[PDB]
């Protein structure tokens, strides 16, 4: 029963800037304490040891320090390819664990996503199936919630989401939502509604269409 | 140059069991325990267990006991890892990584410093279904789209005019559900050009080498 807590879970940078990733104990743990950096299509790379001690050749920027309970890895300078996860590890006692993560990403400014609805095609409604389609591209910052509406009503089941990693030329973020039903349900109602929230609007952003 | 190299990736129907493999290059195989962690979707890593290869001596998560079997064999430079009743929260990345040098003798970190690429595993009991492509058209720059349902298994190869648009395309990351896999893909052209001039996305989906075309035409309704 020993929980690792990292926080924040996203940090939101730009090079140059130093930060500095926390990662708490429920109980002492003495100097067990690992870090890891896992950058995206790679496995995770160990980078300090023992609270403190960085690994061969790990830029001197990494720097740890910690004991007890508290441990804190700190990054002076950022550069472009200290973006990713980073891990805390205990060596403390059995089993080891992990803390969630933490991931290090590129700031931008504000941006407002562009929403699209798509009703289902006729050939696909022909076959007995009915998937209206909402994209929500390039906005930031990455946090989202998009509900979906049919008739002025919330339905939870038959949705499905997908997120593109930050892009790297205007470093925003995608999704598409998908909800998925019977050639039947789709023809019971007849309004269909794309709805999100994000930090740009105080009021939600909706996209929608009736049958007609 | 030390190096892990584990087996390909694999797909697996339920209740089934599996076997991966680590194989070790650059350092003496017996002198350094092999750990073996799950990596889940959500990114959580856990640690699963590590194998003593001088001593076939094993310790495990008390969460994977009855589910994971860790073994060694000298002789290949090998460290394998069994999954038994292979359910659906199974599916995962799993990676092998080395115990770094001890401290003194019985005394580690218990922190790896070499890890292997990983290895996917996805626990489904579809069979290669070529996908279903559906064009999504809308109701100064237009949006369009495609729907390629119900394939298996990943990847599937989406292009734009046979790779003429580049240019304002977002193909989402493919999820799985019910066995099976949903993508979609976005592109946006200005509305100058549509449906003026001909929009078509090019779905290849090797596992079935089906290969299709299809033609974004407005809804007339």
């Known amino acids: 029963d020993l929980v690792l807590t990292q926080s924040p879970a996203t940090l939101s940078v730009t090079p140059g800037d130093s930060v500095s990733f926390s990662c708490r104990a429920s109980?002492?743990?003495?100097?067990?304490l690992h870090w890891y950096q896992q950058r995206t299509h790679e496995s995770p790379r160990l980078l300090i040891k023992?609270?403190?001690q960085s690994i061969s050749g790990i830029p001197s920027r990494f720097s740890g320090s910690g004991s007890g309970t508290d441990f804190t890895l700190s990054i002076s300078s950022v550069e472009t390819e200290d973006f990713g996860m980073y891990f805390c590890?205990?060596?403390?006692?059995?089993?080891?664990?992990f803390g969630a993560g933490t991931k290090l990403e590129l700031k931008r400014a504000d941006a407002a996503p562009t929403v699209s609805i798509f009703p289902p095609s006729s050939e696909q409604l022909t076959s007995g199936g009915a998937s209206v389609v909402c994209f929500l591209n390039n906005f930031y910052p990455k946090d989202i919630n998009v509900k979906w509406k049919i008739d002025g009503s919330e339905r939870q089941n038959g949705v499905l989401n997908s997120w593109t990693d930050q892009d790297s030329k205007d470093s925003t973020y995608s999704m598409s939502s998908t909800l998925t039903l019977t050639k039947d349900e789709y023809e019971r109602h007849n309004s269909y509604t794309c709805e999100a929230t994000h930090k740009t609007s105080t009021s939600p952003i909706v996209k929608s269409f009736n049958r007609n | 140059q030390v190096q892990l190299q584990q087996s390909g990736n694999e797909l697996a129907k339920p209740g089934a069991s599996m076997k991966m493999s680590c194989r070790a290059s650059?350092?003496?195989?017996?002198?350094?325990?092999i750990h073996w962690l799950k990596q889940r979707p959500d990114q959580g890593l856990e640690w699963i267990g590590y194998?003593?290869?001088?001593?076939?001596?094993?310790e495990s998560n008390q969460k994977f006991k009855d589910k994971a079997i860790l073994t060694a064999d000298r002789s290949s430079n090998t460290a394998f890892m069994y999954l038994n009743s292979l359910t659906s929260e199974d599916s995962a990345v799993y990676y092998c990584?080395?115990?770094?040098?001890?401290?003194?003798?019985?005394?580690?970190?218990?922190?790896?410093?070499?890890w292997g690429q990983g290895t996917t595993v996805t626990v489904s009991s579809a069979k290669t279904t070529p996908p279903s492509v559906y064009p999504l058209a809308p109701g100064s720059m237009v949006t369009l789209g495609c729907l390629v349902k119900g394939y298996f298994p990943e990847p599937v190869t989406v292009t734009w005019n046979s790779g003429s648009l580049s240019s304002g395309v977002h193909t989402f990351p493919a999820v799985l559900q019910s066995d099976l896999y949903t993508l979609s893909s976005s592109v946006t052209v200005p509305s100058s050009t549509w449906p003026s001039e001909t929009v078509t996305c090019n779905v290849a989906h090797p596992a079935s080498s089906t290969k299709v075309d299809k033609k974004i035409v407005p809804r007339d309704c």
């Open positions: 023992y609270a403190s």
């Open positions: 109980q002492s743990i003495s100097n067990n």
């Open positions: 650059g350092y003496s195989f017996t002198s350094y325990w």
């Open positions: 590890q205990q060596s403390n006692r059995w089993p080891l664990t």
């Open positions: 990584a080395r115990e770094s040098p001890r401290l003194r003798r019985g005394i580690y970190y218990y922190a790896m410093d070499y």
């Open positions: 194998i003593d290869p001088a001593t076939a001596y094993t």
